[PDB]
Every structure is written in C-alpha cells, then in structure tokens.
Amino acid sequence: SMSKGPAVGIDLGTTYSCVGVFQHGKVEIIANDQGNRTTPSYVAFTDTERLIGDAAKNQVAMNPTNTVFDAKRLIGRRFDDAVVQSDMKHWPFMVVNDAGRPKVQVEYKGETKSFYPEEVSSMVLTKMKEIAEAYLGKTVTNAVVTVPAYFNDSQRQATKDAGTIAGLNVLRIINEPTAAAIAYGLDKKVGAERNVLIFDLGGGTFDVSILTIEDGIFEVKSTAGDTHLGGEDFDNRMVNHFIAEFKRKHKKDISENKRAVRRLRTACERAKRTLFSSTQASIEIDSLYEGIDFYTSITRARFEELNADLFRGTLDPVEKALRDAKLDKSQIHDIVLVGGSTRIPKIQKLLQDFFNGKELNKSINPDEAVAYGAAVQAAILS
Amino acid sequence: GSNSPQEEVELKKLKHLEKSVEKIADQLEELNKELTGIQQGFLPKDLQAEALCKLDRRVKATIEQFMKILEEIDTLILPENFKDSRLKRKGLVKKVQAFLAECDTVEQNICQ
C-alpha cells in the first residue's frame, strides 16, 4: 500500500472540478487520467456501471437521462426553492421531491435509484481524490473544498457532507472569491485595507464578488452576477451566425439536422478558443449538410460583435456589486479574473477600461485559480 | 507534381483516422450481422423484440464514436494545394456518413 500524501485543494465546480497540491514551494494543478487539468462534474449511471468525470461526459449523448451534472445548483437546496424549480425544466435527468428535499432519479443497472445532491457531489469528490492519488502515488485524505460566497448554511453543510461521504477530511470550506484572492497573495500585500473585485466568468455561471481584506481577514462585501451565463451563450451566437451564413450561401437550413448543428457547434467552440490569442479562426467541415462542404472563417472582431450585448452586460453585476459594497470603482485595489471566459480579450478590455486602465490579476490560469488558492490554504492548514 | 513534406504530416493524420474508422466499422459490421441474424433467424417471434433491443447500447456507442471521428476530422485545415489530403478527407467523411446512415438503419429496426 501507498504512503500518506499531502493535503489538496479542490474546486468543486458546477460543470468542472479542479484539484491542486502545494509542494516543492509551488502549486501543481493535477491532470486527471485523460490528461485534463479540469474534470467534468458529471456522474453517469448505465446498465453495467457508474462513470465519473470525462468518462461520464463522454457518453452524455448516448445516455442523457441517466447522466447527472449541475448537482452544485441543487446542493443544500429545498425542492421548492425557485432555483431548483427553474433549473429542473432544462435538465434531461429527473429531479424528485423526497420529503421537501430534491433527489436526482436515474436508471442504474436496470433499477430506479435516487440520490441526494451531496451523494452526487461526493462521487465527483471521490474522483478528484483518486486523481490526486494517481498523480502523487500516495493516499490523499485531507482537503480544502471551495463554495460560492453566496452559499447559505444548508448549501455549505451539504458540501461538507459530500466531502465526508467521499472519505475526505475537509480541513476547511472557503469561499471561491477568497480562494482566488489567496492564490494571488492579496492578503500578503503590505498596508491598509484592500478592496478586491473577483470577476468569475466560467463553467456556466457569472459571479462578481467584492471582498475587503484587512489584517488577513476576508469579509465578503457584496455578490452579484448571472447564474446562467458562459461560454455556451457565446458559442451559440457563433452557431446562429454560421447557420444564417449557410442559409445565405446555400439556401438550406441545417438547423433541424442535430448532427450538422453539433459538428458546427463543436467547431465554434474550438474557433472561440483560437480567438483568445488569434485574430481570426478558420473552419473546414466537409459534407456538413446535404453533402455541402462548409469552409469559412470568423474574425475576433465579428466574434465580439455577435456577443457585444452579452460582454457589455457583464459590467452590470460589477456596477451592482460596487453599489451594494458602497464603494466607488476607484476604490478597488485589486481585480482578479477567474473562469475560462475571462480569456476573451474583449471581456478583459471592457473590465480594464471600466477600471480606468488598471492592470488585472490574470497570470494564473483562470480555470485553476480557485483550486490554486484552495491548495495554498490546504498547505497552510497542514 | 509539387508534393510537400508538410502534406505528409496531414496524410499521416488522415491515415490514423482511417484506421480508427475501420475499428468502429468492424463494430458496426458485427451489429449488422447480429441484426440480420435476428431478422432472418429462428428465434421465437416472441423473443425477437428483446434480442433486437439488446443492440441499443452498442449502436448508440457506435454512432457516438463516428461523431467523435467527424469532430476530429473537422479540426483539420487543408490548403487548396494539398489536393491528395483534401480528397482523402472528403472520402473519409463520406465513408463515416455512410456508416452513420447504416447505424440509423439499425436504430429503425430495434426497440420499435
């Protein structure tokens, strides 16, 4: 058997999770068995087995009703919560009421089974624990797990319970914006009280948090955002643009052909990523629809135009959080970028311009900053 | 007759994708033989429905594997001068699409 390993930091995300470890004086974000530094927060139930992470996400098209995700949207909530009722309409899996508490209901090995959200999140946490052990070659038990700043007592407790069910010794539960500030060493900056704005646009949610750090104490001053905003919305604008382009060029509508739309959507997702660092992206899809080859391109400028209202709209929760925190924008000492969509240059430009040219804390991979801070906290608590 | 060493790289990528398609096509071939076997076989008419619907998981897995191949082929960018690569890419996508049509035929014949 393996020897005892270090404590880890885990970012349990709505769509993806990330695990880091502090060692040799730095944080190492751990790649999973497929070499991915983030792992889908997905659990699938099949005729023969339970699948977690990439293996679960990879078969979603094959088994949609029995592939659970978004458990974080349900954890610690009552069935009648407005959020649960609104969210349920859009999920392919069933959510049932068990004495006031939501449960996901699935078919597993030919039988009807139901799980509490913390049981689903415990399975994701077990995979994160296993990812850390496979990399370290040592057993992992101790972890710092993160939660959104707006989580209430029930949501926080249910997350701690997911950790316990997973066999983790949860050293501490810390807020996601606090983990991001810790990653950048914002509590270590000398001087007076610091006002920090965390701009977190990743994994299908948009969260703005304002924190004040004074003598190493973090206080959440305000939170704002959009629960359902992310990369998929930006990808969809591109898809609409291309479907319209195909109609103009060929007088054919590819929208009802699910495989054609999927090939196009996958290519749009990739082009969007190319646009993070390139000003243009090319797409070549042979035989997209009715044997027609679709060879096209999109500039970063066109991508920005298609998404102009959505990008400029990210400043509304920034203004709302500033008003709730009773602070002028000029009073914000540090701006931190978290989440994959913050890689979009236009989003960075809009935020930097809003803060009158102020440099943004963005050097840490945005997808990993929260796990990075959690791993730093885990090392401190060891 | 201006064949470049650069195109050899793309042709090698396409050959690997062709090999990957051949493996999935072997899975489809077994599904087709099993479907034919059930439709033309001696199973009591009462047990045929169950045998056919047992192919569901495999046919969906086969469809998904082909869709992942198409998404990988869709990442290639081939200049006009790479005529051999473009022809190989076109031929491969057409081969995958014809296999997906065969998968769709299996789905029309099971779990009805």
Sign of CA pseudo-dihedral A324, A329, A332, A334: positive
Domain B1-112 architecture? Up-down Bundle (1.20)
Closest by Cα among A98, A102, A96, A114 to A74: A102
**B90/A283 CB distance under 8 A:** no
Give bridge partners of residue A111 from the DSSP assignment: A108
Which one of A200, A207, A304, A368 is the catalytic residue? A200
A189-229+314-361 has which CATH code? 3.30.420.40
A72 assigned to active site: yes
Residue type at position A314 = T
CB distance A199 to A208 below 8 Å: yes
Q: Domain coordinates of chain A in residue numbers?
A: 1-68+124-188+362-382, 69-123, 189-229+314-361, 230-313
CA pair distance B33, B47, nearest whole angstrom? 18
Answer whether A374's CB lies under 8 Å from A145's CB. yes
* A 217-246 near B (Cβ less than 8 A): none
Q: Do A1-68+124-188+362-382 and A69-123 show the same overall fold?
A: no
Q: How close B45 gets to chain A, by Cα (Å)?
A: 24
Task: Report CA B6 to chain centroid distance, whole Å.
Answer: 28
Would you call A200 a catalytic residue per the annotation?
yes
Pairwise CA distance, residues A211 & A150, whole Å: 12
Residue in A with minimal Cα distance to B62: A62
Integer-rounded Cα Rg, in Å, for chain B is 18
Catalytic residue chosen out of the listed positions A54, A87, A176, A367: A176
Are the C-beta atoms of A43 and A25 separated by less than 8 Å?
no
- Asked if B70 and A263 come within 8 Å (Cβ–Cβ), the reply is yes
For residue A44, CA distances in Å to A85, A106, A199, A329, B32 come to: 22, 9, 31, 45, 28
Across the strands, what pairs with A114?
Answer: A105
d(CA A68, CA A343): 28
Active site residue A353: no
Virtual CA dihedral for A232, A233, A236, A241, nearest 10 degrees?
-140
Q: What does the DSSP 8-state code read for residue A48?
A: S
In 3D, which of A8, A203, A223, A29 has the Cα closest to residue A125?
Answer: A8
**What residues of chain B lie within 8 A of the CB of A298, using their CB?**
none
In the numeric block, which tokens belong to residue B2?
A: 């201006």
CATH number of A69-123: 3.30.30.30
Report whether A104 contacts A50 (CB < 8 A): no
CATH number of the A1-68+124-188+362-382 domain: 3.30.420.40
List the resolution, Å. Answer: 1.6
CATH of domain A230-313: 3.90.640.10
CA gap B80, A344 in Å, rounded: 31
Is there a contact between A286 and B89 if contact means CB atoms under 8 Å apart?
yes
